[PDB]
Amino acid sequence: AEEFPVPNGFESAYREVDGVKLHYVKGGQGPLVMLVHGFGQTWYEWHQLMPELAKRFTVIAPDLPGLGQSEPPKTGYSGEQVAVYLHKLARQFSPDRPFDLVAHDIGIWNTYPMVVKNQADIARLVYMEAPIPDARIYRFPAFTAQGESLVWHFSFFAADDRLAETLIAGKERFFLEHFIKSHASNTEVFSERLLDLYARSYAKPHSLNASFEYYRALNESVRQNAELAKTRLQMPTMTLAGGGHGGMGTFQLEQMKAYAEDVEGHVLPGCGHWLPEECAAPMNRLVIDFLSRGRH
Amino acid sequence: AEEFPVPNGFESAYREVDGVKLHYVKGGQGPLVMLVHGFGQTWYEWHQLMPELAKRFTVIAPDLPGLGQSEPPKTGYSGEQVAVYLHKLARQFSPDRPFDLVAHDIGIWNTYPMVVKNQADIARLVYMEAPIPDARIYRFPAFTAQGESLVWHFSFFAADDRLAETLIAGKERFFLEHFIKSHASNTEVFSERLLDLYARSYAKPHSLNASFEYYRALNESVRQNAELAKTRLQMPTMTLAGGGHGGMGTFQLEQMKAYAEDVEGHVLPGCGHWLPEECAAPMNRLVIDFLSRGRHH
Ligand SMILES: CCC(=O)Nc1cc(Cl)c(Oc2ccc(O)c(-c3ccc(NC(N)=O)cc3)c2)c(Cl)c1
Ligand SMILES: CCC(=O)Nc1cc(Cl)c(Oc2ccc(O)c(-c3ccc(NC(N)=O)cc3)c2)c(Cl)c1
């Protein structure tokens, strides 16, 4: 069974990595690019970008541990722990050559440690729409002069007593529509049909719980990254961020400059957090062009 | 049926104010003191202070509009709108002399504008455990190195789509326990019975909604307060804050110094946000002494 429609010419498969069965969708030929989704979503956010990339690359899009059709991690949900699964997965398909990485939202949290610890394995890097976990996150406001802030949910999701699961169970579809639209500029792309697909996936009890465990591990990931960040990333990197409602704006690039020697950033006007869906045409173009500067 | 037990010598009653039927509990003799509760609670949070205060004052503790047994406001939930109801209520009982005001939590939001606009009517002022709504609240962090912050609910409650009502309905008792205890140092004071009573009250559908409408009007209250604050408060003022887990610490006094010419403050070590229940004896003492420095029975 498949929670989301696989693009024509792609395969949906699973790979056991350190005792954890990871789901992925794969297609294309050439050097490997791994695309890693974020919260509220699955590999499917990449489905419009994938066929295009697959003309020039071998493309893999896994589900994060516990999310989509992937088993929960057995170690834990901190960025360093999860990154091990993603690194080993990628290296199964690219054992003797470096691969490209594109990551959105908590996909960043879950890949940053494997990038910094295995720099020679990463040819080119694209990060969009989430802070790398560090002390900067403790500066984001709980509340703004415009109303609900960007990251108040960090505390909601991290709260003890399974507060978030207890409140959200049974109302996953309602909550996700609010969460996604509140972080979007172009809300119109989130049709009821699309929201139904995403909500059905994260409503699996283990997936709802897994989603929040990433936030419950956030302070641990910050602590991990404080050590790792002592060495800057050396490979070509690009950041994207939305400039519209719900987007990270100039923060994405400004933070990355502290982490990378070689970085170019773009802020996409009229787009919020959900770049692949809100602004598919310019986002896809930026990613393809950036990755195509290397071998393909 | 009363939602909460009335202390001996007090009466539970109602007054219409601007077309809104307000509930209050009243007792004592002497100059008036009005005690205004906050979120998650009702007049009942004052039930331990009331009998002691009633020895020297006439004491009134209303339910905020939409909460407890009070009807919703007919105008709106912004601080300036809600304060009108509280001001006019107090004036019905103290038309000829100024009265004292004690407010906790969002009681502060709902009283500040009437205090600054009718300074002649306010003899002495006590504020505890809540910021006056102003730009300072936009600085509180969403998330901390220790985890769940104390202020993330500002956004949760202010959110549209009836986000909070929709998620909390059916789980009111569970949510309230988490909210109260996560802002407490002394969680033991919140018995199953006490939480049951508070949960049942705020779970009334118009009350659950009222609770969050206070937050949906918070930015408007901030905008209102920006203009009102051009005039400093001149009455004797005391701030109280908890110094333990969940408390506001030095913020209460430090914010108030920007608003008030004549202010003294205390931070209570070992106490969190819910001062009247977590730290009833010293809070009661400080309030009683501060108010008793003025004319009383
Ligand atoms: C330097 C001063 C400063 O900090 N300004 C400032 C204020 C706010 Cl309120 C703010 O909030 C935002 C804005 C856009 C976002 O996409 C997000 C955002 C990003 C990622 C996730 N993903 C996840 N899984 O929760 C969720 C939300 C948050 C930012 Cl970035 C900066
Ligand atoms: C060290 C420098 C500094 O400025 N620290 C600092 C940080 C924060 Cl985050 C902060 O805000 C707080 C702290 C504790 C609280 O219980 C609350 C609080 C207050 C009122 C309600 N009530 C309602 N109904 O929502 C609920 C919670 C707010 C203050 Cl005042 C100071």
XYZ file of C-alpha atoms and ligand atoms in Angstrom:
655
model
C 0.000 0.000 0.000
C 1.058 3.601 -0.661
C -0.060 6.642 1.317
C 0.778 8.921 -1.636
C 0.850 8.423 -5.418
C 4.280 7.506 -6.737
C 5.328 9.490 -9.809
C 5.464 7.542 -13.061
C 8.772 5.703 -13.408
C 9.624 5.870 -9.705
C 9.594 2.947 -7.277
C 8.439 2.843 -3.678
C 10.641 0.587 -1.572
C 12.090 0.040 1.884
C 15.556 -0.345 3.266
C 16.435 -1.695 6.693
C 19.013 0.580 8.304
C 20.281 -0.211 11.818
C 17.176 -2.277 12.520
C 14.826 0.429 11.244
C 12.760 -0.029 8.079
C 12.893 3.216 6.119
C 10.489 3.899 3.258
C 11.735 5.810 0.230
C 10.719 6.670 -3.318
C 13.466 6.424 -5.919
C 13.886 7.131 -9.613
C 16.238 8.419 -12.269
C 19.858 7.785 -13.142
C 23.175 9.451 -12.456
C 24.689 10.929 -9.281
C 22.526 10.600 -6.156
C 20.442 13.402 -4.668
C 18.576 12.712 -1.435
C 15.545 14.912 -0.642
C 14.442 15.021 2.994
C 10.973 16.328 3.954
C 9.870 18.083 7.118
C 7.097 18.225 9.676
C 3.458 17.710 8.682
C 4.540 16.055 5.455
C 6.326 13.082 3.874
C 8.424 12.319 0.784
C 5.391 13.484 -1.216
C 6.207 17.193 -0.830
C 8.978 16.541 -3.373
C 6.787 14.780 -5.926
C 6.687 17.664 -8.428
C 10.440 18.266 -8.187
C 11.394 14.582 -8.434
C 10.643 13.751 -12.116
C 12.574 16.863 -13.171
C 15.640 16.042 -11.075
C 15.437 12.422 -12.208
C 16.359 13.552 -15.718
C 19.863 14.334 -14.423
C 20.201 12.488 -11.116
C 19.321 9.365 -9.242
C 16.763 10.749 -6.798
C 15.774 9.307 -3.428
C 13.141 10.756 -1.100
C 12.847 8.916 2.205
C 10.237 9.238 4.914
C 11.742 10.464 8.189
C 11.830 7.828 10.944
C 8.336 7.350 12.327
C 6.745 9.534 9.661
C 5.128 8.487 6.394
C 5.809 4.776 5.923
C 9.094 4.665 7.886
C 9.512 2.910 11.232
C 10.354 5.016 14.316
C 14.065 5.268 15.163
C 15.388 2.786 17.724
C 18.095 5.068 19.094
C 16.280 8.386 19.519
C 14.986 11.490 17.762
C 17.839 13.942 18.246
C 19.371 15.278 15.044
C 22.584 13.334 15.480
C 20.777 10.020 16.040
C 18.398 10.407 13.115
C 21.152 11.666 10.782
C 22.891 8.288 11.118
C 19.907 6.544 9.516
C 19.715 9.042 6.658
C 23.492 8.968 6.031
C 23.626 5.170 5.931
C 20.574 5.045 3.653
C 22.118 7.465 1.156
C 25.452 5.672 1.248
C 23.781 2.363 0.363
C 22.878 3.923 -2.985
C 26.065 5.972 -3.307
C 28.873 3.997 -1.579
C 31.842 5.283 -3.633
C 30.812 8.808 -4.612
C 29.547 11.868 -2.760
C 25.850 12.683 -3.051
C 23.714 15.846 -3.049
C 21.325 16.763 -0.218
C 18.157 18.896 -0.231
C 16.309 19.248 3.056
C 13.213 21.163 4.158
C 12.115 22.048 7.694
C 13.017 19.365 10.260
C 14.775 17.598 7.405
C 17.522 20.113 8.211
C 17.615 19.165 11.895
C 17.865 15.522 10.843
C 20.702 15.870 8.323
C 22.966 18.630 9.596
C 25.018 16.375 11.907
C 25.723 13.796 9.188
C 26.778 16.588 6.800
C 29.239 18.128 9.226
C 30.569 14.719 10.300
C 30.913 13.366 6.748
C 31.739 16.420 4.636
C 33.466 14.482 1.862
C 30.219 12.491 1.351
C 28.183 15.621 0.502
C 28.893 17.254 -2.869
C 26.312 20.053 -2.718
C 23.724 21.063 -0.133
C 20.371 22.889 -0.248
C 18.579 23.789 2.961
C 15.212 25.525 3.106
C 12.782 26.842 5.673
C 13.956 25.912 9.187
C 16.611 27.020 11.640
C 19.495 24.672 12.238
C 19.010 23.836 15.896
C 21.125 26.230 17.945
C 20.780 28.978 20.591
C 19.151 31.313 18.041
C 15.936 29.349 18.506
C 15.620 30.576 22.105
C 15.268 34.122 20.749
C 12.122 33.554 18.657
C 9.075 35.271 20.234
C 6.113 33.393 21.710
C 3.725 36.044 20.405
C 3.800 38.883 17.877
C 2.104 42.214 17.184
C 0.387 40.381 14.289
C -0.858 37.425 16.367
C 0.331 33.807 16.568
C 4.110 33.559 16.039
C 6.167 31.257 13.813
C 7.392 28.742 16.379
C 5.134 28.726 19.437
C 4.398 25.130 18.514
C 7.972 24.191 19.540
C 6.855 24.452 23.171
C 3.411 22.911 22.497
C 4.974 19.874 20.838
C 7.794 19.610 23.402
C 5.415 19.823 26.374
C 5.369 16.864 28.783
C 2.337 14.687 29.617
C 1.860 14.024 25.878
C -0.050 17.304 25.838
C 0.086 17.674 22.052
C -0.905 14.072 21.187
C -3.666 14.137 23.757
C -5.196 17.319 22.319
C -4.583 16.552 18.636
C -5.531 12.839 18.436
C -8.874 12.622 16.624
C -8.469 16.138 15.235
C -5.365 15.630 13.133
C -6.947 16.845 9.923
C -8.296 20.025 11.547
C -4.988 20.785 13.215
C -2.845 20.159 10.149
C -4.954 22.413 7.951
C -4.568 25.213 10.490
C -0.829 24.604 10.941
C -0.073 24.482 7.231
C -2.231 27.440 6.193
C -1.051 29.600 9.102
C 2.491 29.118 7.838
C 1.615 29.758 4.189
C 1.391 32.790 1.900
C -0.196 30.973 -1.030
C -2.777 28.988 0.928
C -4.787 28.123 -2.193
C -2.485 25.206 -3.106
C -3.574 23.335 0.013
C -6.741 21.796 -1.372
C -8.877 19.648 0.884
C -7.732 16.656 -1.157
C -4.047 17.324 -0.490
C -4.607 18.043 3.192
C -6.566 14.780 3.461
C -3.523 12.845 2.148
C -1.064 14.458 4.557
C -3.433 14.210 7.529
C -4.149 10.509 6.960
C -0.417 9.819 7.145
C 0.488 11.708 10.298
C -2.678 10.529 12.063
C -1.162 7.044 12.417
C -0.678 7.025 16.206
C 3.049 6.202 15.987
C 3.472 9.006 13.429
C 1.643 11.598 15.493
C 3.888 10.683 18.408
C 7.036 10.539 16.274
C 6.292 14.056 14.962
C 6.398 15.504 18.482
C 9.399 13.485 19.607
C 11.534 15.484 17.164
C 10.654 18.589 19.209
C 11.118 16.742 22.488
C 14.690 16.100 21.280
C 15.254 19.687 20.101
C 17.231 20.855 23.147
C 19.417 17.750 22.803
C 20.047 18.574 19.130
C 20.972 22.127 20.080
C 23.482 20.708 22.555
C 24.845 18.329 19.922
C 25.171 21.101 17.336
C 27.057 23.449 19.655
C 29.959 21.006 19.444
C 29.633 20.036 15.775
C 29.402 23.637 14.575
C 33.010 24.229 15.634
C 33.823 23.201 12.056
C 32.213 25.075 9.159
C 30.712 23.319 6.146
C 33.026 23.494 3.124
C 30.844 22.303 0.224
C 28.744 24.586 -1.986
C 25.480 25.342 -0.193
C 22.256 27.171 -1.097
C 19.491 28.282 1.244
C 15.918 29.070 0.275
C 13.309 30.815 2.415
C 9.836 32.251 1.916
C 9.510 36.040 2.047
C 5.750 35.924 2.457
C 3.519 35.111 5.428
C 4.866 32.164 7.402
C 8.327 32.238 5.852
C 11.711 32.526 7.532
C 12.827 35.449 5.382
C 16.407 36.638 5.769
C 17.042 34.425 8.815
C 17.742 31.311 6.776
C 20.720 32.767 4.944
C 21.991 34.825 7.862
C 22.203 31.786 10.151
C 23.726 29.603 7.434
C 26.561 32.088 6.991
C 27.725 31.118 10.479
C 27.760 27.452 9.413
C 29.048 27.435 5.810
C 32.031 28.888 3.934
C 30.305 28.834 0.556
C 26.627 29.820 0.656
C 24.164 31.610 -1.575
C 20.705 32.432 -0.289
C 17.377 33.293 -1.861
C 14.198 34.676 -0.346
C 11.164 33.925 -2.500
C 8.542 36.693 -2.455
C 4.886 35.753 -2.006
C 5.818 32.343 -0.611
C 5.606 31.082 2.955
C 7.000 27.967 4.611
C 5.847 25.334 2.123
C 8.088 26.229 -0.821
C 7.733 23.076 -2.956
C 3.937 23.514 -3.060
C 3.424 27.302 -2.718
C 6.074 28.269 -5.255
C 6.916 25.098 -7.210
C 8.128 26.830 -10.360
C 10.768 29.141 -8.915
C 11.790 26.732 -6.139
C 12.236 23.797 -8.503
C 14.228 25.981 -10.899
C 16.557 27.221 -8.148
C 17.208 23.673 -6.925
C 17.737 22.083 -10.356
C 20.060 24.884 -11.513
C 22.085 24.795 -8.296
C 22.536 21.012 -8.332
C 23.274 21.023 -12.068
C 26.378 23.158 -11.514
C 27.956 19.862 -10.440
C 28.251 16.576 -12.357
C 24.999 15.034 -13.592
C -26.610 26.342 41.403
C -23.354 27.955 42.497
C -20.255 26.767 40.653
C -18.147 27.311 43.788
C -18.941 27.344 47.541
C -19.652 30.817 48.962
C -17.810 31.700 52.201
C -19.895 32.328 55.326
C -21.047 35.929 55.599
C -20.901 36.428 51.843
C -23.608 36.566 49.222
C -23.509 35.407 45.635
C -25.397 37.972 43.535
C -25.824 39.573 40.119
C -25.963 43.083 38.679
C -26.775 44.230 35.179
C -24.088 46.547 33.820
C -24.543 47.934 30.317
C -26.870 45.076 29.395
C -24.522 42.379 30.679
C -25.496 40.339 33.757
C -22.372 40.097 35.950
C -21.925 37.625 38.803
C -20.087 38.534 41.989
C -19.578 37.393 45.561
C -19.774 40.130 48.165
C -19.310 40.576 51.898
C -17.862 42.777 54.609
C -18.317 46.377 55.714
C -16.251 49.488 55.053
C -14.640 51.056 51.986
C -14.840 48.882 48.853
C -12.159 46.519 47.601
C -12.714 44.766 44.256
C -10.755 41.569 43.606
C -10.487 40.516 39.956
C -9.501 36.969 38.961
C -7.815 35.720 35.802
C -7.679 32.913 33.230
C -8.661 29.356 34.172
C -10.275 30.669 37.322
C -13.196 32.636 38.739
C -13.987 34.767 41.792
C -13.269 31.636 43.845
C -9.476 32.026 43.666
C -9.994 34.857 46.165
C -12.048 32.777 48.615
C -9.280 32.560 51.229
C -8.467 36.304 51.133
C -12.091 37.467 51.206
C -13.035 36.628 54.824
C -9.883 38.232 56.248
C -10.249 41.319 54.086
C -13.949 41.562 54.962
C -12.954 42.375 58.543
C -11.882 45.843 57.397
C -13.491 46.340 53.975
C -16.536 45.660 51.870
C -15.184 43.027 49.486
C -16.502 42.274 46.011
C -15.140 39.572 43.686
C -16.802 39.524 40.257
C -16.577 36.899 37.543
C -15.012 38.391 34.410
C -17.499 38.672 31.504
C -18.095 35.280 29.871
C -16.333 33.455 32.689
C -17.687 31.925 35.878
C -21.362 32.865 36.063
C -21.020 36.205 34.245
C -22.583 36.815 30.833
C -20.248 37.569 27.910
C -19.457 41.201 27.149
C -21.777 42.781 24.594
C -19.097 45.165 23.345
C -15.921 43.061 23.154
C -13.033 41.395 24.983
C -10.332 44.071 24.657
C -9.035 45.534 27.927
C -10.666 48.905 27.395
C -14.054 47.370 26.658
C -13.997 44.872 29.508
C -12.781 47.422 32.053
C -15.908 49.523 31.548
C -18.022 46.728 32.996
C -15.728 46.279 35.984
C -15.510 50.044 36.647
C -19.278 50.579 36.483
C -19.865 47.526 38.688
C -17.534 48.887 41.369
C -19.135 52.323 41.152
C -22.588 50.832 41.809
C -21.259 49.837 45.230
C -18.872 52.738 45.831
C -20.437 55.786 44.104
C -19.197 58.334 46.640
C -15.601 57.393 47.391
C -12.660 55.742 45.628
C -12.250 51.979 45.924
C -9.285 49.625 46.052
C -8.462 47.236 43.279
C -6.608 43.947 43.489
C -6.090 42.003 40.244
C -4.320 38.760 39.287
C -3.440 37.368 35.836
C -5.744 38.648 33.074
C -7.632 40.621 35.744
C -4.800 43.079 35.140
C -5.552 43.302 31.419
C -9.203 43.886 32.133
C -8.719 46.578 34.767
C -5.727 48.690 33.702
C -7.624 50.976 31.280
C -10.329 51.851 33.805
C -7.640 52.497 36.433
C -5.631 54.876 34.254
C -8.789 56.610 32.966
C -10.505 57.042 36.367
C -7.583 57.586 38.727
C -9.748 59.581 41.131
C -11.852 56.443 41.672
C -8.948 54.214 42.680
C -7.543 54.656 46.166
C -4.922 51.900 46.097
C -3.911 49.319 43.538
C -2.494 45.814 43.813
C -1.392 43.926 40.711
C 0.049 40.416 40.710
C 1.388 37.924 38.158
C 0.615 39.296 34.703
C 2.162 41.871 32.406
C 0.105 44.905 31.599
C -0.403 44.341 27.847
C 2.324 46.309 26.052
C 5.227 45.654 23.652
C 7.169 43.819 26.378
C 5.051 40.711 25.778
C 6.467 40.409 22.240
C 9.888 39.681 23.756
C 8.958 36.532 25.707
C 10.602 33.550 24.004
C 8.578 30.817 22.295
C 10.899 28.043 23.487
C 13.591 27.618 26.143
C 16.714 25.554 26.730
C 14.690 23.778 29.420
C 11.824 23.009 27.059
C 8.215 24.218 27.070
C 8.121 27.969 27.735
C 5.649 29.649 30.066
C 4.181 31.869 27.362
C 3.620 29.784 24.178
C -0.106 29.669 24.939
C -0.416 33.365 24.053
C -0.261 32.310 20.402
C -2.230 29.057 20.848
C -5.134 30.969 22.427
C -4.940 33.942 20.009
C -4.994 31.719 16.927
C -8.040 31.832 14.643
C -10.068 28.812 13.401
C -11.177 28.390 17.031
C -7.943 26.417 17.320
C -7.913 26.323 21.097
C -11.636 25.540 21.638
C -11.496 22.834 19.026
C -8.450 21.100 20.506
C -9.389 21.573 24.169
C -13.094 20.631 23.972
C -13.634 17.250 25.632
C -10.213 17.586 27.283
C -10.816 20.693 29.373
C -9.891 19.141 32.715
C -6.728 17.598 31.271
C -5.597 20.826 29.634
C -6.320 23.035 32.653
C -4.363 20.744 34.956
C -1.362 20.954 32.639
C -1.631 24.727 32.281
C -2.067 25.404 35.992
C 0.593 22.994 37.207
C 3.187 23.990 34.584
C 2.891 27.541 35.900
C 3.032 26.468 39.561
C 5.718 25.912 42.192
C 3.334 24.477 44.743
C 1.237 22.031 42.744
C -0.132 20.264 45.836
C -2.608 23.076 46.529
C -4.466 22.077 43.366
C -6.480 19.094 44.571
C -8.563 16.924 42.232
C -11.654 18.615 43.643
C -10.324 22.135 43.056
C -9.286 21.350 39.470
C -12.656 19.650 38.896
C -14.496 22.813 39.949
C -12.384 25.126 37.786
C -12.516 22.784 34.781
C -16.294 22.459 34.945
C -16.663 26.249 34.974
C -14.394 27.097 32.065
C -15.649 24.092 30.066
C -19.052 25.755 29.575
C -18.889 26.370 25.827
C -19.417 30.146 26.059
C -16.802 30.266 28.839
C -14.221 28.212 26.948
C -14.644 30.592 24.050
C -14.640 33.656 26.307
C -11.326 32.437 27.771
C -9.601 32.635 24.400
C -11.384 35.744 23.151
C -9.371 37.611 25.801
C -6.286 36.537 23.834
C -7.777 37.208 20.414
C -8.179 40.793 21.629
C -4.697 40.994 23.204
C -2.988 42.870 20.352
C -5.861 45.355 20.378
C -5.390 45.747 24.136
C -1.682 46.423 23.553
C -2.571 49.083 20.994
C -5.089 50.658 23.406
C -2.548 50.640 26.221
C 0.061 52.411 24.086
C -2.174 55.491 24.111
C -3.427 55.158 27.691
C 0.083 54.817 29.131
C 0.864 58.407 28.158
C -0.673 59.139 31.580
C 1.213 57.662 34.554
C -0.654 56.073 37.468
C -0.555 58.269 40.581
C -2.197 56.091 43.251
C -0.218 53.994 45.767
C 0.532 50.701 44.007
C 1.926 47.355 45.114
C 3.083 44.567 42.823
C 3.439 40.918 43.837
C 5.099 38.177 41.838
C 6.200 34.604 42.383
C 9.924 33.929 42.652
C 9.669 30.181 42.110
C 8.982 28.054 39.047
C 6.191 29.569 36.939
C 6.441 33.013 38.511
C 7.261 36.355 36.863
C 9.973 37.365 39.326
C 11.328 40.904 38.967
C 9.348 41.618 35.780
C 6.171 42.624 37.602
C 7.766 45.468 39.578
C 10.138 46.506 36.806
C 7.286 46.841 34.300
C 5.126 48.649 36.843
C 7.830 51.276 37.537
C 7.327 52.463 33.956
C 3.590 52.892 34.631
C 3.346 54.090 38.210
C 4.814 56.979 40.188
C 4.297 55.338 43.578
C 5.008 51.617 43.570
C 6.466 49.030 45.892
C 7.013 45.430 44.894
C 7.619 42.011 46.385
C 8.815 38.751 44.890
C 7.717 35.689 46.868
C 10.371 32.944 46.917
C 8.988 29.417 46.650
C 5.800 30.572 44.888
C 4.752 30.323 41.266
C 2.084 32.045 39.186
C -1.006 31.251 41.237
C -0.208 33.382 44.279
C -3.601 33.361 46.023
C -3.580 29.549 46.138
C 0.108 28.620 46.143
C 1.088 31.185 48.738
C -2.129 32.316 50.384
C -0.755 33.242 53.824
C 2.029 35.643 52.797
C 0.095 37.003 49.811
C -2.941 37.661 52.000
C -0.733 39.341 54.626
C 0.945 41.660 52.130
C -2.315 42.667 50.481
C -4.088 43.251 53.791
C -1.256 45.354 55.226
C -0.850 47.420 52.058
C -4.578 48.173 51.824
C -4.889 48.765 55.569
C -2.418 51.648 55.378
C -5.344 53.576 53.873
C -8.731 54.394 55.418
C -10.694 51.313 56.500
C -13.134 49.772 58.975
C 16.262 37.632 14.762
C 14.873 37.912 15.233
C 13.859 36.847 14.987
O 13.998 35.753 15.510
N 12.726 37.103 14.134
C 11.770 36.054 13.893
C 10.510 36.003 14.464
C 9.643 34.950 14.190
Cl 8.050 34.874 14.880
C 10.017 33.924 13.332
O 9.056 32.917 13.176
C 9.035 32.112 12.053
C 8.908 32.657 10.788
C 8.876 31.798 9.699
C 8.952 30.421 9.824
O 8.917 29.609 8.703
C 9.071 29.873 11.087
C 9.135 28.374 11.161
C 10.250 27.678 10.714
C 10.288 26.292 10.765
C 9.204 25.584 11.259
N 9.269 24.154 11.285
C 8.831 23.306 12.354
N 8.965 21.903 12.190
O 8.350 23.727 13.390
C 8.078 26.281 11.687
C 8.043 27.663 11.637
C 9.098 30.722 12.200
C 11.312 33.977 12.764
Cl 12.026 32.831 11.682
C 12.144 35.036 13.058
C 15.309 37.281 32.457
C 14.676 38.354 31.633
C 13.202 38.270 31.407
O 12.606 39.233 30.952
N 12.534 37.049 31.754
C 11.132 36.785 31.579
C 10.759 35.787 30.691
C 9.424 35.492 30.496
Cl 9.003 34.248 29.387
C 8.442 36.183 31.184
O 7.103 35.913 30.974
C 6.430 35.120 31.884
C 7.050 34.349 32.857
C 6.281 33.560 33.723
C 4.899 33.528 33.594
O 4.134 32.733 34.431
C 4.288 34.294 32.601
C 2.807 34.288 32.489
C 2.135 35.455 32.823
C 0.762 35.506 32.755
C 0.050 34.389 32.357
N -1.373 34.387 32.316
C -2.226 34.060 31.232
N -3.629 34.096 31.468
O -1.799 33.784 30.130
C 0.725 33.215 32.032
C 2.103 33.166 32.102
C 5.048 35.091 31.767
C 8.809 37.194 32.057
Cl 7.546 38.035 32.878
C 10.152 37.498 32.266
